[PDB]
């Protein structure tokens, strides 16, 4: 109830001080800088391997931040939402997922101008990387929300349970890499962005429903 005050709540719980907001920024920066230490300093090498670097960093951030989205609540705050808030469970879980993005995607997007200069990306490359990144990163919380809830709240879970979390994100990253490679080659990519645009408008509609049902089943 009052979607935005929930939003303010999970804004407050995750962050404690004005100094510690940029923690995901520092994670992104160290993950990116790990590669030129190992791959090499040559720009052309680092130029062409940009998509893997950037979306691997995004994948790491998403996986690290999804565990905290649900596992901690099991001990203390998993309920009081399935049990209160007469508003539909899809609404509150959508709030959780979108704030999960806005504490991870927003730092990554706002950091994109810097990282593109580290890897030698050009303005067109930065533009396509930013527009795809803002178009695909929110989805990472969408499909990951049902998977993480089961793996952190279902006991006697086998190895096959994690297959609904990590490998389901492969299509997103492969389309992202292919699209921004095509853009890096200086080609129009609008059709690829439409595919990303199509999946974002579609997954956002069905993700909260399945996630709410998954939490309902998992708490029992």
């Amino acid at each position: 109830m009052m979607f935005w005050r929930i939003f303010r709540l999970e804004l407050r719980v995750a962050f404690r001080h004005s100094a510690e907001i940029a923690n995901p920024l520092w994670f992104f920066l160290i993950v990116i800088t790990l590669f030129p230490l190992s791959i090499g300093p040559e720009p052309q090498l680092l130029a062409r391997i940009a998509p893997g670097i950037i979306w691997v960093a995004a994948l790491l951030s998403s996986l690290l931040a999804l565990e905290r989205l649900f596992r901690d609540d099991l001990q203390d705050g998993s309920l009081e939402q399935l049990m209160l808030l007469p508003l539909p469970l899809p609404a509150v879980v959508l709030a959780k997922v979108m704030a999960h993005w806005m504490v991870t995607g927003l730092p990554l997007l706002i950091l994109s101008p810097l990282v593109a200069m580290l890897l030698g990306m050009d303005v067109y490359g930065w533009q396509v990387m930013a527009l795809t990144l803002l178009l695909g990163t929110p989805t990472l919380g969408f499909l990951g929300a049902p998977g993480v809830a089961l793996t952190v709240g279902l006991k006697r879970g086998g190895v096959l349970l994690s297959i609904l979390v990590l490998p389901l994100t492969i299509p997103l990253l492969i389309f992202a890499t292919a699209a921004m490679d095509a853009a890096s080659m200086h080609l129009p990519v609008d059709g690829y962005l439409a595919i990303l645009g199509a999946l974002l408008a579609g997954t956002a509609t069905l993700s909260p429903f399945a996630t709410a049902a998954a939490l309902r089943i998992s708490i029992q």
Partner: protein
Amino acid sequence: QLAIPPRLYQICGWFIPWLAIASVVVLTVGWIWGFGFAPADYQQGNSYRIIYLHVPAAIWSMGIYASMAVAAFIGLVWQMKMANLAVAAMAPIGAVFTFIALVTGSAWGKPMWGTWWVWDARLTSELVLLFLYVGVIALWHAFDDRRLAGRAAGILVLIGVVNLPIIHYSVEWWNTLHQGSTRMQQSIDPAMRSPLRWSIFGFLLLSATLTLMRMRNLILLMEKRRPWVSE
């Protein structure tokens, strides 16, 4: 004959005016005697004036990391409570110095490389030092309970300082494997030495100012509940 009581708050109060005004005077004399009263090199042209503004930041980054090392070393083995507090006082000052050195080095290198980013030993090392800083700040801000952030922070500082020369010599050796050497030798020239040293001292003394203010703030934040703070 150390006392180290909360009376050190008064000790900090007894230094801020004098040392701060001395710092501002030396900085302004360095930056007017530099940045407009000294010539430049033949090759880089007038852009060489970044030295007065770029080198001291880098030098004092390492200097106050050594200060971190000595303060935490005192605070751990002797169990000095305030000595562990010095880490948080100098942490964001270090972060700012190293960030400034990074941005200047990147900005100074634009005319000679043509690009805003060059993965050289000097810049890359500064990135790792900044990372050690921001790790220290993050660790200290992670603890809700004080009196712990400063002991764990001290251990982190010790781990950093032990590994720091190894990392720096590795990245220096890493650069040799790919490119081979630096651009050109180091020539300060007598006509361009005194202003640089005076700027070094000015950054020293402004760092001292900021460390003292942060010590005073941390003293208040820690001993916030004792009736000593009734004022």
